[PDB]
A = this chain, B = another copy of it.
Amino acid sequence: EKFLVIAGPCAIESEELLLKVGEEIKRLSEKFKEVEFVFKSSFDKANRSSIHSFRGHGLEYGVKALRKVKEEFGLKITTDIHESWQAEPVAEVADIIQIPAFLCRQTDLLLAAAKTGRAVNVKKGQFLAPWDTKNVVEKLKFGGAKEIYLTERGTTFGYNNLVVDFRSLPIMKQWAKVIYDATHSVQLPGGMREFIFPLIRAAVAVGCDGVFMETHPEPEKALSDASTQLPLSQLEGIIEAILEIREVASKYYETI
Complex CA distance for A199 and B138, rounded to whole angstroms: 28
User: Which of B51, B84, B203, B206 touches A107 (beta carbons < 8 Å)?
Assistant: B51
User: Which of B46, B138, B199, B251 touches A51 (beta carbons < 8 Å)?
Assistant: B138
Is A189 engaged at the interface, CB distance under 8 Å to the other chain?
yes
Least Cβ–Cβ distance between A161 and chain B, in angstroms: 5
From known contacts A82-B106, A166-B202, infer whether A126 and B156 are also in contact, taking CB-CB under 8 Å. yes
User: Which of B47, B107, B190 touches A47 (beta carbons < 8 Å)?
Assistant: B107
Is A108 engaged at the interface, CB distance under 8 Å to the other chain?
yes
Q: Which of A106-129 contact B (CB under 8 A)?
A: 106-108, 125-129
List chain B residues, Cβ under 8 A from A195.
167, 170
Is A107 within 8 A of B157, CB to CB?
no
Q: Which residue of B lies closest to A143 (CB)?
A: B51
Is B199 within 8 A of A129, CB to CB?
no
How many copies of this chain sit in the oligomeric assembly?
Answer: 4
List chain B residues, Cβ under 8 A from A155.
156, 163
List chain B residues, Cβ under 8 A from A106.
46-47, 82, 102-103
Q: Which residue of B lies closest to A55 (CB)?
A: B107
From known contacts A49-B135, A156-B156, A190-B128, infer whether A167 and B83 are also in contact, taking CB-CB under 8 Å. no
Q: Which residue of B lies closest to A156 (CB)?
A: B156
A8-16, A30-38, A212-220, A241-249 - interface stretch: A241-249
Is A20 engaged at the interface, CB distance under 8 Å to the other chain?
no
Is A252 within 8 A of B248, CB to CB?
no
List chain B residues, Cβ under 8 A from A249.
201, 205, 241, 245, 248
Is B197 within 8 A of A252, CB to CB?
yes
List chain B residues, Cβ under 8 A from A245.
205, 245, 248-249
What are 16 of the A-B contact pairs (CB < 8 Å)? A48-B107, A51-B135, A82-B108, A83-B83, A102-B103, A102-B125, A125-B127, A132-B189, A155-B163, A166-B166, A167-B198, A170-B195, A201-B207, A241-B252, A244-B248, A245-B245
A47-B105, A132-B160, A198-B207 provided; 10 other pairs, C-beta below 8 A? Answer: A50-B139, A129-B160, A155-B156, A157-B165, A159-B161, A169-B198, A201-B205, A201-B207, A202-B203, A205-B206
The 3 closest A-B pairs by CB, nearest first: A158-B158, A205-B205, A202-B202
